[PDB]
Amino acid sequence: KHNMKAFLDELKAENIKKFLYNFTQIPHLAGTEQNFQLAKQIQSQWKEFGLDSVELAHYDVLLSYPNKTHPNYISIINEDGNEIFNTSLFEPPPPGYENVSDIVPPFSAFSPQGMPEGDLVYVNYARTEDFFKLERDMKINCSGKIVIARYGKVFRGNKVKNAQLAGAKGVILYSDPADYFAPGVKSYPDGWNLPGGGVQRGNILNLNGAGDPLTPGYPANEYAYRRGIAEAVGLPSIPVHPIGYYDAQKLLEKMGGSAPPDSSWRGSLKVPYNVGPGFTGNFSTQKVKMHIHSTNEVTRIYNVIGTLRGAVEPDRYVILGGHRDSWVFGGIDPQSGAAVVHEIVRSFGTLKKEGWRPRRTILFASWDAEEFGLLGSTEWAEENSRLLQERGVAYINADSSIEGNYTLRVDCTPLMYSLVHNLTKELKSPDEGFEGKSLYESWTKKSPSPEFSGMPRISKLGSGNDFEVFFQRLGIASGRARYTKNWETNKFSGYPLYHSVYETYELVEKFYDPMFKYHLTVAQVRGGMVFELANSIVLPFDCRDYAVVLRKYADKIYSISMKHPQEMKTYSVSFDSLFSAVKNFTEIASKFSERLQDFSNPIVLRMMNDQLMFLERAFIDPLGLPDRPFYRHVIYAPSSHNKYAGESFPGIYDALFDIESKVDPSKAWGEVKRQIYVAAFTVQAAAETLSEVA
Amino acid sequence: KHNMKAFLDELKAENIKKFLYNFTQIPHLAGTEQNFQLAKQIQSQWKEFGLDSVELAHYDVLLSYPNKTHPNYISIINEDGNEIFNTSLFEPPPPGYENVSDIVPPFSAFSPQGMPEGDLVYVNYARTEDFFKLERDMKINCSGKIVIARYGKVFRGNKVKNAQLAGAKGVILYSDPADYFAPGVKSYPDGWNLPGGGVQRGNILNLNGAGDPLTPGYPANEYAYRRGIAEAVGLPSIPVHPIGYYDAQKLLEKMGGSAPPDSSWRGSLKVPYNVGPGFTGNFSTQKVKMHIHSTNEVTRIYNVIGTLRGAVEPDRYVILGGHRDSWVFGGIDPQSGAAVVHEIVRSFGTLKKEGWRPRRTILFASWDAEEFGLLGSTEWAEENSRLLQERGVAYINADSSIEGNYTLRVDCTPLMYSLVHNLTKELKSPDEGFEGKSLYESWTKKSPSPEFSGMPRISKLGSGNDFEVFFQRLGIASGRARYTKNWETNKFSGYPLYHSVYETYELVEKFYDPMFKYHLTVAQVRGGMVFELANSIVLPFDCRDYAVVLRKYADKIYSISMKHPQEMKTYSVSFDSLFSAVKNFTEIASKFSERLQDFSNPIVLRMMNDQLMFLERAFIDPLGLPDRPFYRHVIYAPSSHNKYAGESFPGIYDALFDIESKVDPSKAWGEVKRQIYVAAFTVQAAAETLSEVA
Numbered sequence A, B: 001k002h003n004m005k006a007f008l009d010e011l012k013a014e015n016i017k018k019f020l021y022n023f024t025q026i027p028h029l030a031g032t033e034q035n036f037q038l039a040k041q042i043q044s045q046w047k048e049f050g051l052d053s054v055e056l057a058h059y060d061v062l063l064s065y066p067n068k069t070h071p072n073y074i075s076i077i078n079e080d081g082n083e084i085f086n087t088s089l090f091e092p093p094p095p096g097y098e099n100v101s102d103i104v105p106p107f108s109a110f111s112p113q114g115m116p117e118g119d120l121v122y123v124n125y126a127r128t129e130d131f132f133k134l135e136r137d138m139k140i141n142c143s144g145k146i147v148i149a150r151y152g153k154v155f156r157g158n159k160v161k162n163a164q165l166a167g168a169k170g171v172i173l174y175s176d177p178a179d180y181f182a183p184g185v186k187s188y189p190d191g192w193n194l195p196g197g198g199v200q201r202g203n204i205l206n207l208n209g210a211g212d213p214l215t216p217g218y219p220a221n222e223y224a225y226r227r228g229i230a231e232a233v234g235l236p237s238i239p240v241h242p243i244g245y246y247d248a249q250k251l252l253e254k255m256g257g258s259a260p261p262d263s264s265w266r267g268s269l270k271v272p273y274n275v276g277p278g279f280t281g282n283f284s285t286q287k288v289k290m291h292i293h294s295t296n297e298v299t300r301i302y303n304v305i306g307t308l309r310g311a312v313e314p315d316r317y318v319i320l321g322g323h324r325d326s327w328v329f330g331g332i333d334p335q336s337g338a339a340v341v342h343e344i345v346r347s348f349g350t351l352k353k354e355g356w357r358p359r360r361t362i363l364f365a366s367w368d369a370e371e372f373g374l375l376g377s378t379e380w381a382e383e384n385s386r387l388l389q390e391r392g393v394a395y396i397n398a399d400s401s402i403e404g405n406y407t408l409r410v411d412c413t414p415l416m417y418s419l420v421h422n423l424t425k426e427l428k429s430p431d432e433g434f435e436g437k438s439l440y441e442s443w444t445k446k447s448p449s450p451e452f453s454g455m456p457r458i459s460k461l462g463s464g465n466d467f468e469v470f471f472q473r474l475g476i477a478s479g480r481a482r483y484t485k486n487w488e489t490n491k492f493s494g495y496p497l498y499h500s501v502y503e504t505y506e507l508v509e510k511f512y513d514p515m516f517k518y519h520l521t522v523a524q525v526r527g528g529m530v531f532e533l534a535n536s537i538v539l540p541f542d543c544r545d546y547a548v549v550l551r552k553y554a555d556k557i558y559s560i561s562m563k564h565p566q567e568m569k570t571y572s573v574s575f576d577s578l579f580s581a582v583k584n585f586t587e588i589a590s591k592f593s594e595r596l597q598d599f600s601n602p603i604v605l606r607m608m609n610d611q612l613m614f615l616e617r618a619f620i621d622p623l624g625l626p627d628r629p630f631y632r633h634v635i636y637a638p639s640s641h642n643k644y645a646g647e648s649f650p651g652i653y654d655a656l657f658d659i660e661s662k663v664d665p666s667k668a669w670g671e672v673k674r675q676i677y678v679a680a681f682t683v684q685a686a687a688e689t690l691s692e693v694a
């Protein structure tokens, strides 16, 4: 038989291991020849595996690279102008790869050029609340200073945006051992911790979903009109560079001015974590000088797009996509995900060769330039938006399959909650102590839902990965799943070797997943979801699960507003419309579910499948969110303070944020009321798509 | 049998006559009690006629009305400040209606209040080119003057926008006998010409598709957040008032300053048509003073929405809609259209009572507040946009069925050209001299296509009626058809009694259509289109007809650009991408048509019907046109100089318009190139929706 069990049994840990090794022997940086060769290899193999069509879709996008003959570095400079300390020009390469060339040195992609020189101020994680504390409570002025911030907690682009609006003339990012060195584990190559010379790469854009900075709204094809660099979307205005904790120690150790305000501002280095500005007495004449010479350049990128045509609904698309480009070797990010995708394609192709096809079309994607701002997935979605709008059932992301080995982590639309619960109950747990138990049981034990006893945690989607365009711009139901660590406070920080040269095959095989059993479990979860989405007669979405979360989100936003009861009285700020809409959605969803359970008629089926598919689409406002036209989903958007985190009712949340500091409270509360109307209207409109059609 | 012939034979001229009489005995001004009572009557009757559901959808929108106890008028005022001449406070009412009350006096809806006083300048039709002639050639400065313009040629809102940007402090609109008095015909009540006391009402908004000025993007429902009046969309900033030619004569006869520049500036009154500014010698101290006291107020409006549920595809909607609100009696506009819609509903209901249902759902709409800026249709479409987006097959408008008795006039998407040709070949011509001949034959003889021998003219859609939101914002295939006059130069001016108190039942029955045969023909065309759209197994759209017009439109925009060959060389302005896209669209459309002709499989059918339905949708850019976010169709938009006229490739057209006067030609030509890319991309994207789906 050709059923989900046949699909799942065909997946093999040893194949995923073979593929990971094959994908991680040389760097695959976006825009380079190596990454083009890998794209060509994957295209050839996906054809061999049995896909109906496999094409490269290429775009010419803005990328960023250091200048090979003019290296980026930071100095402490004396009053004569002698550079008495320099940060490293590269990470010491891992054992056996000290002869690989084309390892890109650590840099912050898209930093402008400059050589700013100034006094340091330490801004903790450079979060919105850290800047509030500095400026409002400590009365420390960041204007004209170089800010030094530790990585962690929030997306680095948000740190740089925050520093820029504080008036900083430069940003130094570093990895503190508090966030990137787990106690009791050894540094690479003898354990999975970050060495003092390790550095986290990463882009510092604030694109807000735009894709290629030069072509917002339209694909960067051969005849594209490009904005000038001055009008480009999302580029930082001040230079930025990342360093490791050996170099950070040298910069922080001389810091003077104010004591840190409390212990949450102290990392693990042997320094005072003084906030500054500037150095203590004897060194008060020394300054810090950045030297940044990276260049932005329009460069070709290549997505691999594979098609497995549906037997019954070939005009309905289930998409499994993840990126292929890496900072260096990509041992976890992304090749641990890409190796899983390759084995999933191989398994679907095996069934295809035996005569089977899925009910709906499955599209497989190997995205390029994800590391430079989700460019490959976004450009392809801009090119194909009309097809995706009208035909896209679901998108399942597939970046890193593991970031730890403790338990499952899932983020998805509420429409997939029931699907994920049902699938994990049929999968075997790979965890020690749970042999013979289901993945649902181990996951629920290790990661309990905060609200429901006997259910696991599933988080909201935000951004920071290639599902963003599909879910936040186009309103296609999306999900993702991976194996994760225990470390709750580190959930947005990355694992210790994230975006460093030390993310290698050896890291994964020695320290994360030697038997590839966690990889296999994740291939079963991602592959299983795609199989059910592409083959179930009725789409496996439960609208009642959206009704449940919409009430939670409404209660939550109401509670935030109710921190200001006098203003709510004065400006007559009522949430009645929004609760009414959510109540209506609950009632209509309940009636729709009854009809779905109670209807031989393929028109009623497909009419009902169309109602299910277009339900996520109904949450899209074609006018977008305020000043963020490419974030259009009214229930979910990436947090304005942390692109990695999902925020619920983001239009209302942002209207309420820091509202007590607004100078015209009448205008500010007016805008809260406007967002309440938009949200109530959209919830009601979405509910009405589930009513009887005529 | 229940086929189109059964539907068509059930339509009766005498019923349309009965209904027109019933709809025109009292005024039905938007927002008034009379118009609410008519809405209730129509709802009751549509239920009686056999519709499955008939509901009122109400909204609270900004309307505008004169102040009943402080009338609007214009004066000539002497240097003492004595008002020596006053324009009329009302039109002499027609015979037998001199005792109807609640006849709203002539006014320009949405004019602000004011009493500006100044010198007159005569600006012909106040078109963009008339203002260019005045300002650039004649060097006449409109700043601080009152402009007097004749109605005709372009939408009056565009006249007022043009006057405002010229710096006018007021606008007087009048009907010149050259445009509104056909030679050799008598004035009402003895013929269909405009009397000297007749006045054309009408709104002067520039909404650009927004709908209710206070709630752009969202329906004006009970919890809607409204903009303040200062931020309202589309309101004029200077007072405006319309007058008849007896009053115009008194204002124009004293005009001095420059002679008219040529004969195209002279109307038919016994005046010099001097441009001004100001009056001749002896009267040079007299001024003109406007007195405008109208008020804008949020007022409830009611649409009637009737549903006839489809037997096989109830989730696919064919919409027949037209408005019900009128300036006064609405004898032609809109009741001649509404009476036809009522008889169409009656005929479909008769077949329904015999057990028949259409394949797809048919929705019938009686829109309110069309006269105040398409408010009723736009608010309902904003409320229902997700349903319409995903389920709307076509929209057929039904305002005035007659504006003359010479021949048919059709404007529609190219997707309906073949449908209209085929239907008119099966209908009998009602014209004298064509008895026993088809409507196609009479229409083609009287209104030949400019490009094709043996085919009739069909025009583009622009705006100025309730199809605008469906076609220009949502991308639903739309069409309209009516009987028209011979008068080519008057095609945007209206018939003589347009928007005057003299548009009565007697006007239609005595002078336009005494046997209601032209009304019946139009009911057969509109009703026939709706029947075919709702019942044909394959949607009756021919994508190859779009490919033909896209080439014409590309040749046309290329030719406009080629008036500037040196700039095209300098800035490398190439149309190659756009021609390539159109060539591709032609090829793919041809292959799609072959497959459509060559496929028992309802999935392939409905997949193919979905490709046909979503083809118009593919021309929508979700980013809208520049500064016009609610005009989203890339091929068609209402002309920026005349809302009534359709413009093709409007983004490129507007980028090229008057480009030689732009101060930064590099920037201006950059923007032309950007619009060429957007258009080429969208044409290719639309073509790709017709490719094989996987």
Ligand SMILES: *[C@@H]1O[C@H](CO)[C@@H](O[C@@H]2O[C@H](CO)[C@@H](O[C@@H]3O[C@H](CO)[C@@H](O)[C@H](O[C@H]4O[C@H](CO)[C@@H](O)[C@H](O)[C@@H]4O)[C@@H]3O)[C@H](O)[C@H]2NC(C)=O)[C@H](O)[C@H]1NC(C)=O
Binding pocket: A577, A578, A580, A581, A584, A680, A681, A684, B222
């Ligand atoms: C959730 O679904 C329910 C439907 O089950 C839906 O209820 C609707 O609520 C609206 C607004 O609350 C009702 O609107 C009323 O409609 C009547 C005519 O039917 C009008 O006469 C009412 O207007 C008068 O009263 C107003 C309120 O005080 C005044 O402001 C106004 O000036 C008038 O005097 C009023 O518009 C509507 O009838 C119901 N529909 C029903 C019960 O079927 C509700 O709106 C949905 N929630 C959301 C957020 O959409």
Ligand SMILES: *[C@@H]1O[C@H](CO)[C@@H](O[C@@H]2O[C@H](CO)[C@@H](O[C@@H]3O[C@H](CO)[C@@H](O)[C@H](O[C@H]4O[C@H](CO)[C@@H](O)[C@H](O)[C@@H]4O)[C@@H]3O)[C@H](O)[C@H]2NC(C)=O)[C@H](O)[C@H]1NC(C)=O
Binding pocket: A222, B577, B578, B580, B581, B584, B680, B681, B684
């Ligand atoms: C109409 O449909 C046709 C398809 O039948 C489609 O043709 C496509 O045109 C594009 C752009 O013209 C082609 O793009 C080329 O792709 C190859 C790889 O396949 C690249 O190597 C090419 O890049 C080189 O050459 C460029 C042009 O001089 C340089 O700018 C560049 O730096 C490289 O050196 C180039 O990108 C594409 O292959 C075809 N596809 C085909 C033939 O199947 C056409 O684009 C459609 N028209 C529109 C408006 O969409």
Ligand SMILES: *[C@@H]1O[C@H](CO)[C@@H](O[C@@H]2O[C@H](CO)[C@@H](O)[C@H](O)[C@H]2NC(C)=O)[C@H](O)[C@H]1NC(C)=O
Binding pocket: A021, A022, A023, A025, A026, A040, A041, A044, A045
């Ligand atoms: C990764 O695996 C691929 C596929 O087996 C290897 O590419 C093949 O290399 C062999 C031997 O040189 C050639 O004969 C084939 O043409 C290649 N097949 C392709 C590209 O589809 C590749 O060499 C392996 N890479 C590494 C780094 O081990």
Ligand SMILES: *[C@@H]1O[C@H](CO)[C@@H](O[C@@H]2O[C@H](CO)[C@@H](O)[C@H](O)[C@H]2NC(C)=O)[C@H](O)[C@H]1NC(C)=O
Binding pocket: A081, A082, A083, A084, A085, A086
């Ligand atoms: C840090 O790096 C800088 C740049 O290479 C070093 O300063 C240079 O030293 C060379 C050789 O002495 C001089 O010729 C250059 O003029 C210097 N350049 C600048 C910009 O100062 C510096 O020696 C290094 N500092 C340390 C402590 O190693």
Ligand SMILES: *[C@@H]1O[C@H](CO)[C@@H](O[C@@H]2O[C@H](CO)[C@@H](O)[C@H](O)[C@H]2NC(C)=O)[C@H](O)[C@H]1NC(C)=O
Binding pocket: A418, A419, A422, A540, A541, A542, A597
């Ligand atoms: C997850 O599994 C549950 C339990 O099997 C499914 O719920 C059942 O679905 C069938 C078919 O509609 C019903 O007859 C049962 O009453 C349901 N049981 C319940 C609600 O407890 C549920 O549909 C599955 N979710 C999916 C497939 O998304």
Ligand SMILES: *[C@@H]1O[C@H](CO)[C@@H](O[C@@H]2O[C@H](CO)[C@@H](O)[C@H](O)[C@H]2NC(C)=O)[C@H](O)[C@H]1NC(C)=O
Binding pocket: B021, B022, B023, B025, B026, B040, B041, B044, B045
């Ligand atoms: C227009 O026609 C309607 C429908 O026949 C008339 O309304 C009816 O009036 C009669 C006699 O007063 C009542 O018994 C019915 O209740 C009405 N039916 C409705 C409203 O559905 C209406 O009076 C006619 N109007 C004019 C101006 O002739």
Ligand SMILES: *[C@@H]1O[C@H](CO)[C@@H](O[C@@H]2O[C@H](CO)[C@@H](O)[C@H](O)[C@H]2NC(C)=O)[C@H](O)[C@H]1NC(C)=O
Binding pocket: B081, B082, B083, B084, B085, B086
């Ligand atoms: C035009 O209308 C105005 C306003 O009604 C007339 O002027 C008024 O005349 C009355 C009676 O003589 C005076 O009490 C008012 O003070 C006048 N008002 C203003 C604003 O001037 C005027 O007589 C009319 N002109 C003509 C020629 O009929």
Ligand SMILES: *[C@@H]1O[C@H](CO)[C@@H](O[C@@H]2O[C@H](CO)[C@@H](O)[C@H](O)[C@H]2NC(C)=O)[C@H](O)[C@H]1NC(C)=O
Binding pocket: B418, B419, B422, B540, B541, B542, B597
């Ligand atoms: C208009 O009528 C023409 C002529 O009947 C239709 O074109 C024919 O359609 C059938 C069915 O696909 C074909 O077998 C014939 O070859 C067509 N004749 C032609 C192209 O000359 C056309 O489909 C009708 N248009 C509609 C219904 O939109």
Ligand SMILES: O=C(N[C@@H](CCCCNC(=O)c1ccc(I)cc1)C(=O)O)NC1(C(=O)O)CC1
Binding pocket: A155, A202, A203, A333, A370, A371, A372, A373, A374, A399, A400, A409, A410, A411, A464, A465, A480, A481, A482, A491, A492, A493, A494, A644, A645
């Ligand atoms: O590196 C990126 N993404 C990694 C970032 C990991 C760090 C934060 N992790 C999460 O937000 C996360 C949330 C849910 C799941 I299931 C997994 C990871 C990823 O999404 O795997 N994205 C970019 C980035 O520079 O941040 C390259 C764009």
Ligand SMILES: O=C(N[C@@H](CCCCNC(=O)c1ccc(I)cc1)C(=O)O)NC1(C(=O)O)CC1
Binding pocket: B155, B202, B203, B333, B370, B371, B372, B373, B374, B399, B400, B409, B410, B411, B464, B465, B480, B481, B482, B491, B492, B493, B494, B644, B645
């Ligand atoms: O009055 C309006 N519409 C009439 C306007 C008639 C004058 C210009 N005529 C056309 O643009 C026209 C084009 C195609 C067809 I088929 C019929 C008329 C109508 O569309 O019947 N619309 C408004 C207006 O004030 O202009 C009320 C909004």
Ligand SMILES: *[C@@H]1O[C@H](CO)[C@@H](O)[C@H](O)[C@H]1NC(C)=O
Binding pocket: A067, A068, A069, A070, A295
């Ligand atoms: C990189 O630096 C070198 C050496 O100083 C310089 O010649 C070249 O212009 C730079 N390359 C760039 C900016 O791409």
Ligand SMILES: *[C@@H]1O[C@H](CO)[C@@H](O)[C@H](O)[C@H]1NC(C)=O
Binding pocket: A141, A142, A143, A144
């Ligand atoms: C910070 O410093 C600059 C001057 O160096 C000044 O313009 C700015 O207003 C200061 N900001 C605050 C909040 O003190």
Ligand SMILES: *[C@@H]1O[C@H](CO)[C@@H](O)[C@H](O)[C@H]1NC(C)=O
Binding pocket: A192, A404, A405, A485, A511, A512
């Ligand atoms: C894998 O799990 C084991 C067992 O608890 C643990 O000791 C090891 O540190 C884990 N690896 C990682 C990277 O968390």
Ligand SMILES: *[C@@H]1O[C@H](CO)[C@@H](O)[C@H](O)[C@H]1NC(C)=O
Binding pocket: B067, B068, B069, B070, B295
């Ligand atoms: C209309 O004019 C009257 C009489 O001068 C005035 O009292 C009233 O305020 C006005 N009505 C309005 C502005 O709605």
Ligand SMILES: *[C@@H]1O[C@H](CO)[C@@H](O)[C@H](O)[C@H]1NC(C)=O
Binding pocket: B141, B142, B143, B144
């Ligand atoms: C028209 O008149 C006003 C002054 O009354 C002046 O400001 C404006 O610039 C003039 N415009 C032209 C084009 O002469």
Ligand SMILES: *[C@@H]1O[C@H](CO)[C@@H](O)[C@H](O)[C@H]1NC(C)=O
Binding pocket: B192, B404, B405, B485, B511, B512
């Ligand atoms: C109706 O047609 C007749 C015959 O040509 C013509 O004399 C009459 O003026 C027409 N009515 C209108 C309003 O055009």
